[PDB]
Ligand binder design. Structure first.
Ligand SMILES: CCCCCCCCCCCCCCCCCC(=O)OC[C@H](COP(=O)([O-])OCC(O)COP(=O)([O-])OC[C@@H](COC(=O)CCCCCCCCCCCCCCCCC)OC(=O)CCCCCCCCCCCCCCCCC)OC(=O)CCCCCCCCCCCCCCCCC
Ligand SMILES: CCCCCCCC/C=C/CCCCCCCCC(=O)O[C@H](COC(=O)CCCCCCC/C=C/CCCCCCCC)CO[C@@H]1O[C@H](CO)[C@H](O)[C@H](O[C@@H]2O[C@H](CO)[C@@H](O)[C@H](O)[C@H]2O)[C@H]1O
Ligand code: BCL
Ligand code: BCL
Ligand SMILES: CC[C@H]1c2cc3[nH]c4c(c3C)C(=O)[C@H](C(=O)OC)c4c3nc(cc4[nH]c(cc(n2)[C@@H]1C)c(C(C)=O)c4C)[C@@H](C)[C@@H]3CCC(=O)OC/C=C(\C)CCC[C@H](C)CCC[C@H](C)CCCC(C)C
Ligand SMILES: CC[C@H]1c2cc3[nH]c4c(c3C)C(=O)[C@H](C(=O)OC)c4c3nc(cc4[nH]c(cc(n2)[C@@H]1C)c(C(C)=O)c4C)[C@@H](C)[C@@H]3CCC(=O)OC/C=C(\C)CCC[C@H](C)CCC[C@H](C)CCCC(C)C
Ligand SMILES: COC1=C(OC)C(=O)C(C/C=C(\C)CC/C=C(\C)CC/C=C(\C)CC/C=C(\C)CC/C=C(\C)CC/C=C(\C)CC/C=C(\C)CC/C=C(\C)CC/C=C(\C)CCC=C(C)C)=C(C)C1=O
Ligand SMILES: CCCCCCCCCCCCCCCCCC(=O)OC[C@H](COP(=O)([O-])OCC[N+](C)(C)C)OC(=O)CCCCCCCCCCCCCCCCC
Ligand SMILES: COC(C)(C)C/C=C/C(C)=C/C=C/C(C)=C/C=C/C(C)=C/C=C\C=C(C)\C=C\C=C(/C)CC/C=C(\C)CCC=C(C)C
Ligand SMILES: CCCCCCCCCCCC[N+](C)(C)[O-]
Ligand SMILES: CCCCCCCCCCCC[N+](C)(C)[O-]
Ligand SMILES: CCCCCCCCCCCC[N+](C)(C)[O-]
Ligand SMILES: [Fe+3]
Lengths: 302, 240, 281
């Protein structure tokens, strides 16, 4: 059988690659981590270096504090019993304040206060991480596409935990921290708003989520199919189109009557993906603030 | 209501985005042509976008697209029908002439460079201290073609330095010259490397590289094209 | 009309059936034996959908719905207006999709490229067949399949899901969703990374894959690399669909109670089942 380039047959290794300098403060990069031969069958073997820096420390600290606030609450719910902790791990939940507290921070620790504290740490962790996606691109002289794409994910997260609850006038509207409880919240949210299948922004979000899997399967397969002509060296194919890019384009042209370019497919990609959470966040933000029941809204079309 | 306004606005945005994406994707290969290379009458409803310019590193200049399209190489095919839409028959040996699935593009006759301006791809013997780190080391193995005859022996691996990966096997032929084989077109086995794409008598015809320690984008395209072309054109010499 | 670089690829050869008989293009589209087959299957299925619409009494695209046979028909045939049209349309759809994949194979052969794309597409076809064929057959009736209607198929999703409680609790469904979300995350990051390198800050030279690796190493401490990211997107998308098919093929067959209750196996493990405290004690 022909080799299909899903796993590599032979790995090679040279000196640890310390990366491009550009305007990066090298004093903030770690040393390299271990090389993983296991990872190396599918992707790069090299781990690290990673960029630290003070904003990075803030994100990591704040993110760890979020995780540990939830975890300590879980231990408390477990009665500090390790066996119970593991047994009931997916059932524990850190829940927002009751509706009576509105948007106040006056809720007692065990009744919403600790959720507010965990949420504050999460807010700092995510936004300081966003700053990092921007600044690491800036230091390398790169465009800011990653930061812009990340902002679309942040939009849905912000709508769910912050913007919508504020507009609704209570933290009780926000998502609990727990494995099963967040799934329960999601089901309940749909039931209470008259079935999200009737929310056209939910339908669109689904089209883009399915469409992201369609497009990445198409693009991943295409690049592998032309990897025998160096297709995955996409930047140099953009700069100097080769037979890889031409055969990729013509496969699609002959199949469905139109095609992309090596650069342009990545614009289809970024937009297909970001539209998942852009449309999703709109759909959720409108729910309960403007539309109480999507079935009813859809009967009026408006 | 606000939701109706939002959804209406979204569909208008989406139509505009699709128009943007489709036109961005017309920066290569357009205007469409007739089979004789002249501009086609029907270009479709999307116009070409305003040109953009990529600044290339290491003094290599710029690329501006869209721009005048030309193959910049002879194409040895001829019509097989009196109207549009039929295949074009090779006028010579399609493997030698580089057409059909043996096609290459007239890319720049210079090597791809890494971020430090060094040659991206080097023979492993010239790449300090690159080495095989896992899997069967193919160096020293006999190379077998789809006629099940031995065509040569592997004498090195050509490696992508910045990406740390095997990109070609360098194979020495009976006459002592060597050729590069795309890593994606070989099967490394315990006792041999097998190349389904080529029968042993076609190895000599693999395009050669002008300098023995680097490979240009043009040369890579000729080599990769020729090897892949063998799946169709060596099918007679293959071989259950 | 042709792309400017297209003529050199339009050679004869690569067909699986029929030799040169159907080896030609219509405009941009390659035909081939399987182009003719897709056309036949697609045309027939569309005609039968139009006939179903006439029998249903509507032309409104948002109202047309072709329903499978009621459960009482089991795995038998049904009268055309009562599930038989769904049955024939399903054969047509399957024919059209499989023909499409095989026409992709012919295109790969003519172009000298790998077969990855139709192999990937086959996963989507198998998910479709899981819902309309494999699962209905295992459960013993065509009526367990979904109807062909823009809105009525969503009614089927909702009705089917809630048959087993909150469907979120299906563990294969949790894995499928994780792959779908991870795939979209990877797609956004891949598209952004390549664009961020090709379109750098104003006046700067294009970046290199070295800068792409450096950006990710700086950001998270690991870069999967330019080959790896395309292997990954392919794996995440195909895994999402594999676990989707799996989560449905087990539902109504091996597991048919409320999915939430499946999780009691973990809770009730002898070593902690009886310990007081927590949520379940
Ligand atoms: C509400 C939701 C809340 C929103 C939250 C988050 C939103 C995140 C948006 C995601 C953007 C990802 C796309 C990245 C991109 O290509 O833009 C790069 C661009 C910067 O490029 P770079 O990467 O820094 O540098 C590389 C090159 O120099 C230059 O790089 P380049 O060439 O790749 O970038 C050029 C770019 C220019 O950059 C941009 O400004 C991108 C802008 C984004 C958007 C828009 C959002 C739409 C949401 C839907 C709303 C519908 C209403 C419901 O051109 C475009 O990509 C844009 C066009 C497509 C839209 C065309 C559309 C439709 C209009 C209408 C219909 C008309 C007729 C139909 C009938 O990004 C931005 O500046 C915009 C980001 C937002 C920043 C806000 C802060 C400033 C105030
Ligand atoms: C997603 C968004 C997709 C965006 C669409 C982009 C379309 C780009 C077209 C750009 C032009 C382009 O270069 O691609 C072409 C045509 O594309 C298709 O026909 C094929 C069109 C297929 C697209 C079908 C869309 C499906 C809708 C899906 C739902 C999603 C909708 C979103 C909201 C190329 O087509 C050639 O250039 C002309 C384009 O107008 C002309 O059509 C010409 O004339 C042909 O002469 C033949 C005579 O025997 C005739 O029989 C044949 O049918 C004709 O096409 C072709 O050779
Ligand atoms: C019974 C359940 C209801 C339902 C109720 C909901 C609700 C409620 C919501 C969705 C939403 C969505 N639904 Mg729905 N949904 C239903 C049925 C479906 C069906 C189906 C039946 O086949 C499908 C395919 C979908 C599909 C979808 C998605 C398209 C969409 C979420 C997109 C996303 O990427 O979120 C995942 C992405 C995020 C949440 C963004 C995360 C952002 C960042 C900032 C994360 C930070 C993480 C960090 C701090 C932790 C770090 C740890 C790391 C290890 C370091 N739903 C039924 C009708 N659905 C969402 C939506 O947009 O709706 C419009 C939503 O709120
Ligand atoms: C109330 C409803 C229940 C629910 C009930 C179910 C049920 C029931 C099902 C799913 C299934 C899915 N659900 Mg669920 N699920 C719910 C909540 C969610 C949420 C959420 C955020 O809450 C999410 C993200 C999901 C996500 C998932 C996915 C794992 C899976 C759908 C993708 C798929 O099967 O693709 C597979 C892809 C296909 C089937 C597409 C095949 C198409 C191909 C072959 C051809 C089409 C071509 C043609 C017609 C084109 C026309 C021509 C033009 C030119 C274009 N569900 C709630 C709790 N879920 C489904 C599943 O797993 O199915 C296997 C499923 O049946
Ligand atoms: C376009 C929408 C899609 C999307 C896009 C997207 N997500 C993004 C981005 C983009 C473009 C990034 O740039 C950003 C990223 O950096 O990715 C690598 C990110 C990201 N999306 C993430 C998660 C995520 N995205 C999600 C989904 C989506 N993201 C959408 C599908 C989801 C879902 C589907 O629920 C999740 C859970 C993160 C991987 C990353 C944002 C990272 C972040 O904000 O981190 C802040 C928190 C920390 C720094 C610490 C986290 C705490 C840990 C739980 C504890 C243990 C880990 C710790 C870091 C170990 C260190 C220990 C040391 C002491 C040694
Ligand atoms: C496996 C990973 C993902 C994937 C992969 C994938 N899909 C693919 C491909 C790949 C690699 C293709 O190569 C092929 C393609 O050419 O894409 C452009 C394709 C494709 N995926 C498509 C659609 C699609 N893929 C989907 C999803 C997915 N595809 C997966 C998530 C979905 C979802 C999620 O709902 C849809 C709608 C098409 C764009 C295309 C296949 C086109 C095709 O088969 O054309 C031939 C057939 C016709 C032209 C029409 C046939 C008509 C029938 C005879 C009658 C209709 C019956 C139908 C069952 C009615 C449905 C009604 C609905 C309202 C329910
Ligand atoms: C790097 O490379 C890459 C490219 O190129 C450089 C590419 O192009 C692409 C391709 C990707 C795009 C062009 C991006 C946009 C695509 C999507 C968002 C995916 C969804 C696509 C659609 C919804 C369009 C679907 C169109 C179809 C299926 C064509 C419809 C045709 C018919 C009417 C079928 C009837 C019968 C036919 C055509 C058979 C032939 C018979 C006769 C003509 C007779 C990828 C992935 C890629 O990675
Ligand atoms: C959000 C996710 C991000 C990951 C957070 C990574 C934190 C790890 C920090 C380790 C450290 O500080 O240095 C120890 C160092 C060892 O010490 P050292 O290398 O810093 O010591 C030498 C330093 N100088 C030269 C400055 C003196 O090890 C590493 O560098 C390891 C980094 C590998 C981390 C890989 C995680 C990848 C997983 C993420 C991909 C998935 C998407 C998310
Ligand atoms: C073994 O024990 C150890 C030590 C390891 C600890 C164990 C840790 C464990 C078990 C932790 C488990 C964590 C879990 C299960 C987390 C699950 C999280 C989930 C599922 C979250 C899902 C959705 C979350 C959302 C949408 C959150 C949105 C939050 C915001 C947008 C922040 C909003 C900010 C607020 C309300 C603060 C306002 C105050 C100011 C000043 C801004
Ligand atoms: C990157 C852009 C890709 C465009 C994909 C558009 C698909 C539209 C799907 C129709 C959804 C309609 N609905 C019912 C949700 O409102
Ligand atoms: C088997 C389901 C019937 C499908 C009908 C044909 C699809 C037409 C596309 C829907 C267009 C929606 N629109 C424009 C009427 O609003
Ligand atoms: C916790 C985040 C990771 C997401 C993966 C979803 C967990 C579902 C695991 C179910 C598998 C149980 N099983 C089959 C091993 O017994
Ligand atoms: Fe790519």
């Amino acid at each position: 059988a022909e080799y299909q380039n899903i796993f590599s047959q032979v790995q090679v290794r040279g000196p640890a690659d310390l990366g491009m300098t550009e305007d990066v403060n090298l004093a903030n990069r770690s040393g390299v981590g271990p090389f993983s031969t296991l990872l190396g069958w599918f992707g790069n073997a090299q781990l690290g270096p990673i960029y630290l820096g003070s904003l990075g420390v803030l994100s990591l600290f704040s993110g760890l504090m979020w995780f540990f606030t939830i975890g300590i609450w879980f231990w408390y719910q477990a009665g500090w019993n390790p066996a119970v902790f593991l047994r009931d791990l997916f059932f524990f939940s850190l829940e927002p304040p009751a509706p009576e507290y509105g948007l106040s921070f006056a809720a007692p620790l065990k009744e919403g206060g600790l959720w507010l504290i965990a949420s504050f740490f999460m807010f700092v962790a995510v936004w300081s991480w966003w700053g990092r996606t921007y600044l690491r691109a800036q230091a390398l002289g790169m465009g800011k596409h990653t930061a812009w794409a990340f902002l679309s994910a942040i939009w849905l997260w912000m709508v769910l935990g912050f913007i919508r609850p504020i507009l609704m006038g209570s933290w009780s509207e926000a998502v609990p921290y727990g494995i099963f409880s967040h799934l329960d919240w999601t089901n309940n949210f749909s039931l209470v708003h008259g079935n999200l299948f009737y929310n056209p922004f939910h339908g669109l979000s689904i089209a883009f989520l399915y469409g992201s899997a369609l497009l990445f399967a198409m693009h991943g397969a295409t690049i592998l199919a032309v990897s025998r002509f160096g297709g995955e060296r996409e930047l140099e194919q953009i700069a100097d189109r080769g037979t890889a890019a031409e055969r990729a384009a013509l496969f699609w042209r002959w199949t469905m009557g139109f095609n992309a370019t090596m650069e342009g497919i990545h614009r289809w990609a970024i937009w297909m993906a970001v539209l998942v959470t852009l449309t999703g966040g709109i759909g959720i933000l409108l729910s309960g603030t403007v539309v109480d029941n999507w079935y009813v809204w859809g009967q009026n079309h408006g | 209501d606000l939701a109706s306004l939002a959804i209406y606005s979204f569909w208008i945005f989406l139509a505009g985005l699709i128009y943007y994406l489709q036109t961005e994707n017309m920066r290569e290969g357009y205007p469409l042509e007739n089979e004789d290379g002249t501009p086609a009458a029907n270009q479709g409803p999307f116009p070409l976008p305003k040109p953009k310019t990529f600044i290339l590193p290491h003094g290599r200049g710029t690329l501006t697209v869209p721009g005048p399209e030309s193959e910049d190489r002879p194409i040895a095919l001829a019509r097989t029908a009196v109207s549009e839409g039929f295949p074009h028959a090779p006028t010579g040996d399609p493997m030698k002439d580089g057409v059909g699935p043996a096609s290459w593009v007239a890319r720049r006759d210079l090597p791809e460079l890494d971020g430090h301006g060094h040659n991206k791809i080097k023979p492993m013997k010239a790449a300090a201290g690159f080495h095989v780190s896992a899997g069967k080391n193919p160096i020293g193995l006999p190379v077998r073609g789809c006629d099940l005859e031995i065509a040569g022996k592997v004498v090195d691996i050509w490696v992508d330095i910045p990406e740390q990966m095997a990109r070609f096997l360098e194979v020495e032929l009976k006459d002592g010259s060597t050729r590069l084989l795309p890593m994606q077109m070989v099967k490394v086995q315990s006792n041999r490397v097998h190349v389904n794409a080529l029968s042993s008598d076609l190895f000599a015809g693999i395009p050669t590289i002008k300098s023995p320690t680097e490979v240009t984008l043009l040369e890579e395209d000729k080599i990769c094209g020729y090897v892949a072309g063998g799946l169709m054109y060596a099918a007679p010499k293959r071989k259950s | 009309a042709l792309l400017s670089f297209e003529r050199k690829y339009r050679v004869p050869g690569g067909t699986l059936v029929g030799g040169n008989l159907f080896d030609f293009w219509v405009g941009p589209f390659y035909v081939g034996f399987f182009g003719v087959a897709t056309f036949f299957f697609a045309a027939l299925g569309i005609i039968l959908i139009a006939w179903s619409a006439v029998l249903q009494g509507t032309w409104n695209p948002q109202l047309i719905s072709v329903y499978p046979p009621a459960l009482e028909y089991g795995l038998g045939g049904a009268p055309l207006a009562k599930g038989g049209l769904w049955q024939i349309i399903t054969i047509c759809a399957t024919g059209a999709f499989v023909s499409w994949a095989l026409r992709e194979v012919e295109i790969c052969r003519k172009l000298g490229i790998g077969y990855h794309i139709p192999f990937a597409f086959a996963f989507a076809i198998l998910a479709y067949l899981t819902l309309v064929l494999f699962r209905p057959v295992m459960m013993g009736a065509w009526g367990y399949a979904f109807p062909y209607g823009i809105w009525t198929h969503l009614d089927w999703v909702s009705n089917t899901g809630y048959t087993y409680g909150n469907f979120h609790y299906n563990p294969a469904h949790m894995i499928a969703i994780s792959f779908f979300f991870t795939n979209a995350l990877a797609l956004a990051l891949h598209g952004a990374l390549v664009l961020s390198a090709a379109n750098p800050e104003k006046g700067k030279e294009m970046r290199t894959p070295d800068h792409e690796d450096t950006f990710f190493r700086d950001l998270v401490g690991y870069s999967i690399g330019t080959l790896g990211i395309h292997r990954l997107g392919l794996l995440l998308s195909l895994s999402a669909v594999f676990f989707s098919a799996l989560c449905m093929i087990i539902t109504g067959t091996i597991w048919f109670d409320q999915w939430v209750d499946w999780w009691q196996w973990w809770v009730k493990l002898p070593w902690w089942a009886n310990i007081p405290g927590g949520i379940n004690g």
